[PDB]
Amino acid sequence: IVEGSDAEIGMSPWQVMLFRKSPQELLCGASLISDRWVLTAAHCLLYPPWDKNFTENDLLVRIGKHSRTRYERNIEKISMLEKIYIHPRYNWRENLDRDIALMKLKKPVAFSDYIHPVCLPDRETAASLLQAGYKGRVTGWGNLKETGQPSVLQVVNLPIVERPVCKDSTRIRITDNMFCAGYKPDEGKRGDACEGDSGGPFVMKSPFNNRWYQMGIVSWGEGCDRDGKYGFYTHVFRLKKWIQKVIDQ
């Protein structure tokens, strides 16, 4: 996260760290959607341009974390993966269309003050919250700058940007399965997700029922926090039918 702030304790209890076993490093962000299901970006697990093709046994999910590097004894819970499910129409060749993946945990995770799942939106929550100017929140342990790393989880609030403005900021073709967020150069305020934030959640707090919903997944951008550029997110509600199908099994 570039131009964010340290998260408060228990501020994002659905935050998941995707951790590579060997070498021991941060792979991606992710999110807790139930006691056994974790949501992430498909490119965190499969990205042929960079020779990325992780299997279940190559990683661990670390839940309830605040510190990036330390082992949070009595706080975080580390889980092993039973199965990875990548969207069958995930487009890694061009624009990361349908950049979404589900991960089934071997054992259910126990909820605590630091571990709690985020909601997934219904058609109405999505229609009412996914509006240009409405702010969401992005969290992660990614790069603090484009060209270092935070000690603790970082947070940034960012407004959803109008579809024409997103499309006009880039040469990449944008689909209905993505949305962009961030401030314009004129707005004053700054902020963006960056490398290592991928797979993390873009959340919004419903003013109707006061619950947090995951509206986006950190997907891509061109650099980080560049003027006239915006971060792109997987549109979760557009792919909820695939999510439901995999969970229903």
């Binding site: 076993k21 021991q24 490093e25 661990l60 590097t69 330390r70 082992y71 580390i78 092993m80």
Partner: peptide, 10 residues
């Protein structure tokens, strides 16, 4: 720079 994690997690 990542602190070691208990052996039980492989």
């Amino acid at each position: 720079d990542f602190e070691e994690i208990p052996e039980e997690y492989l």
